[PDB]
Design a protein around this nucleic acid. Sequence first.
RNA 1: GCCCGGAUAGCUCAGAAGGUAGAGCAGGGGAUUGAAAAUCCCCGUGUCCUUGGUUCGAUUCCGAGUCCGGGCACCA
RNA 2: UGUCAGGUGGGGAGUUUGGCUGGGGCGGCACAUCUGUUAAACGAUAACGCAGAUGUCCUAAGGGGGACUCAUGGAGAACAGAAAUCUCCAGUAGAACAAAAGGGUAAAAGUCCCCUUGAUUUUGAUUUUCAGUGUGAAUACAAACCAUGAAAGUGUGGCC
RNA 3: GUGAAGAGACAUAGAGGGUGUAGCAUAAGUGGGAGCUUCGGCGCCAGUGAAAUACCACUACCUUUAUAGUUUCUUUACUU
Lengths: 217, 101
Amino acid sequence: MSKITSSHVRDNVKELLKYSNETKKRNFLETVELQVGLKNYDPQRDKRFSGTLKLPVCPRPNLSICIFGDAFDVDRAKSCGVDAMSVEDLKKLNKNKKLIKKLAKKYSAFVASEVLIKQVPRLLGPQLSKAGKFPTPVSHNDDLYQKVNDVKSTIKFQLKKVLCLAVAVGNVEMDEDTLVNQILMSVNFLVSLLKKNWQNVGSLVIKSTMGPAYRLY
Amino acid sequence: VNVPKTRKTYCKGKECRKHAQHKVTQYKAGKASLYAQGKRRYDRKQSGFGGQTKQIFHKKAKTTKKVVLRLECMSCKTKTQLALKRCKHFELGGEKKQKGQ
RNA sequence: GCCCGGAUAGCUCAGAAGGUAGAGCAGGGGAUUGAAAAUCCCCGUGUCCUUGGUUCGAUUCCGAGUCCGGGCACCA
RNA sequence: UGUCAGGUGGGGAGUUUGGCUGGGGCGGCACAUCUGUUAAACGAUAACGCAGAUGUCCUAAGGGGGACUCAUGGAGAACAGAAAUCUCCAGUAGAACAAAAGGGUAAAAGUCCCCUUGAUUUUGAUUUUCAGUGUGAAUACAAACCAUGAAAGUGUGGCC
RNA sequence: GUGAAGAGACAUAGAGGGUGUAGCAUAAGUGGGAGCUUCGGCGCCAGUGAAAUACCACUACCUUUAUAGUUUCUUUACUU
Ligand SMILES: [Zn+2]
């Protein structure tokens, strides 16, 4: 009630994030995610659609970024926190299978310039695949300092071969009433794919890294 | 017969109202719905004692059936219908070509 | 038009869930016997109906499309 | 026992069980169409007359532009032979053009190479069978919107 | 009309149930994920692969049952 339990939506957050015993407390910035249970859970014959819809309030489990920019973007990247890379450097990474797995699992975010979106998904593709961390659309005239927010804001919506999604919804840094709000947006994009959402005001928990048995609906 | 899949053609549109790209899918007939005026007139009549108060066709000579193409626009996604001459086989897309062996 | 079942070596018939490609019919040689049969041994034979697909891999599984053989429906 | 629904039910009830046709029936299609001829040098024209075809196949075998000549024969080139590929000379079509047959076509309507969707939209006028009714096909424009070519042009499906 | 006792669940339940191969080792999956913990230990780290593990949770796939809820019911008794 009150637009998906607005009374105990922020008190849920207030009791988790600022706690060492209940929420363990890691050194990196603790990110929050959701879970919801619809009656629409069918494996399907057609197979699942998967449409990566954006959100204006930023999702963003961004630890490291490994770019592929050249000429303009190498100058812009080195000034910022990220680190640049060359075209011939990609051939050295692919030459052994181990260093591809380091780029796959940890380095989640990506930035690739307009000229370097014509050589990328061949070598990584088969080895990567299940993670699905491919580059973002970027041109040479971008700012890079601002472009970190665009990758951070966007998130995957792939649903195949399992009856669950887990879309992130802010973190420790973001405001209290945003997270949730985001809750209205996050569920709405599930309603875009499915027919019957079950049923506007459904189920939630708050799982911020060490989200304990606080268990929601 | 084979057809290209997508093709350029005129659409009425009203925006628009010129040549543009299209998708191509095959037209299938809808289910009879059970609440049309003729079905209600038929079921009211056919109830009592008498048995089949109308004609039942079973002198079907010819073999095939005309193929129809449901064209769907790209921009405003309005739809049209373009018929085709009678043929037994029909692959909507798209085993080209070949020539020049 | 509906919802089901089956396809495998030249022939015929298994296969069976997770990782193979097989008994037989024959067909070819050995072993055995004074020989002629019956029996132990060692071979050659595959688009696993057809396509993209599905898959770490699959004839299977998984979902499409066409070819063979059997059922309950019928107002131009 | 009563009402409604599913099977069974010639035990009984009602009704139909083509036409042309050297009598009918058995065959056949001459019963919707197309080519040549019968058909008597405008058109029209019969028989279960004669020789034969159709219920399809094609995103190219449709549309535009540019290259180039085919049947067959002769003279020469290792394996190569009557027949493989290569080169020259003669070559009015004696080839080819999705199928029946007739017509048509040679810097092409044939063969090869480049780009595409005029097999598109809105409606009427007009030839053929003809009651100058319909059905089918075909021809010539108007207003649009496109393709192709340096252009003139050509194209509202298949050379007729 | 009136009484007795055997079966399919839907709530709602976590104990587990998972052993091809390479991987300390019996990996059903999906996310967050660099420390929880006094120390202990196990992870990040490193490494084997198609897939990474702790620490937290959600979803399946199979067994279990002890809930007085649905009825496919199935078994007998009582006279008006
Ligand atoms: Zn339009």
